[PDB]
Amino acid sequence: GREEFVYMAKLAEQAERYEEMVEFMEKVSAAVDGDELTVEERNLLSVAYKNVIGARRASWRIISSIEQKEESRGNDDHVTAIREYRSKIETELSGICDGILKLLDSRLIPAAASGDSKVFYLKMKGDYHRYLAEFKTGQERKDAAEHTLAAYKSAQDIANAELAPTHPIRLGLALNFSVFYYEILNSPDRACNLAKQAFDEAIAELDTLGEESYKDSTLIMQLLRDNLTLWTSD
Amino acid sequence: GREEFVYMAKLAEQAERYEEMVEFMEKVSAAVDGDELTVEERNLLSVAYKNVIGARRASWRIISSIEQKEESRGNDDHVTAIREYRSKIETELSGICDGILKLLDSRLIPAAASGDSKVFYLKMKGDYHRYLAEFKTGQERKDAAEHTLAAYKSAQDIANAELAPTHPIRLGLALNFSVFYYEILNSPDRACNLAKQAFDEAIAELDTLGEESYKDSTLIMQLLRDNLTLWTSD
Amino acid sequence: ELFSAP
Amino acid sequence: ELFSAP
């Protein structure tokens, strides 16, 4: 049942056993055929996959640094061992992304009925194609980068048309889209322009706020500034 | 074989993939027939197991708290679901403890040739029998408590006779032994006296330590004090 | 040390 | 808030 698996997902979260949280939410999604996940369920699913992928991304990064350092020292035996270990982490990364992408393409995106949900899931699709682009090479990298740009640019079209410039989902899309430009496409100018644009469009309607609603918007907008601060001084 | 699996253990540590660090250190211990693990190898093996068991212990604590709150004031079906989940974490805890205890009984303790290494591995045996006592019930708890005290008391005898009162291993044994009294046996008086005794005997000859050994001993001693401060106020 | 969305 | 050995 949907209720039971949501509860198990909350138990896994508390226990920080995120691989099992993914499974419980994977079963929540299966129990919700055609209908949309609740905001709560939608957020639990993303918290479940973010941590799971977050750990492997962390591992992959630290392992890559070690590989390069060992390459600089000439330890071929160490480099060989590191590459096989990195390849194992990359296999997990591929499987984690494939799991959420399979769910996004076949169930979540097709069922999204509001502009809110449409910009959330497409954004998530771009996020996890972006994670693939972080480590893939060759044709698989370009295929992942293009799927990211397609999903982000699509999500952008709906966001500009149906979401306020201060909406957290829209701001999050602009932040991640700008990161995509800087890191994956190595286009710093396009990254800065998008981050500033999304920020300027927000501050224009920011003062038309409540008191406890722009807590989430101010958080994303500060990240946009921080990235701009780093990108502007090289 | 030995040196390759040590390196792999170090990579797994950097990657914070500790279950794999346990496997690599298991292969190191198998490749070292009769001989003792190096201080480096010996310390990598406990970091590995410490983190693997540390995660499940954290998970078990939080799940237990939720089970009690649901049992006192909530749904029974929630309790049923929590119990099954806690039971799954206890199965992992048992398996992890079983892996290191087997390695300790069959290789490490038999092969320990110095009082230094004997206190270390006996202390570790008590640690992982204590971790069993943290969640086991009935006969399995009684068996765990008996094995902990036996291992700690044995280790204490060698430590007092062959290790300086400032030696980190001896201080660590006292700390864990004192915790065992307070938490497992509910003997606060014996816990406080053993902690104070190990702390006093250390401060007596702390002048003999250098600058890299003064940091190791003072770290454990601060933990003894912190526990005493909490225990003395109850 | 860049930041993506939470 | 009770600690064991590292």
Author numbering:
A (entry chain B), B (entry chain A): 4 to 237
C (entry chain L), D (entry chain K): 1267 to 1272
Study authors write:
Many phosphoproteins of the BR signaling pathway, including BRI1, SERKs, BKI1 and BZR1/BES1 can associate with 14-3-3 proteins. In this study, we use quantitative ligand binding assays to define the minimal 14-3-3 binding sites in the N-terminal lobe of the BRI1 kinase domain, in BKI1, and in BZR1 from Arabidopsis thaliana. 14-3-3λ and 14-3-3 ω isoform complex crystal structures reveal that BKI1 and BZR1 bind as canonical type II 14-3-3 linear motifs.
No binding was detected to the unphosphorylated peptide. We found that pBKI1265−272 bound 14-3-3λ and 14-3-3 ω with slightly lower dissociation constants when compared to 14-3-3κ. We found the C-terminal 20 amino-acids in 14-3-3 ω to be disordered and thus crystallized a truncated 14-3-3 ω1−237 in complex with pBKI1265−272 and pBZR1169−175, yielding better crystals diffracting to 2.35 and 1.90 Å resolution, respectively. We next made use of the high number of molecules in the asymmetric units of our 14-3-3 ω crystal form to study the structural plasticity of pBKI1265−272 and pBZR1169−175 binding. We found the N-terminal Glu267–Leu268 peptide to bind in different conformations in the 10 14-3-3 ω molecules in our structure, consistent with the moderate binding affinity for pBKI1265−272 in ITC assays. We found Arg136 and Tyr137 to form hydrogen bond networks with pS270 in pBKI1 and with pS173 in BZR1, respectively. Asn233 forms hydrogen bonds with the backbone of both peptides.
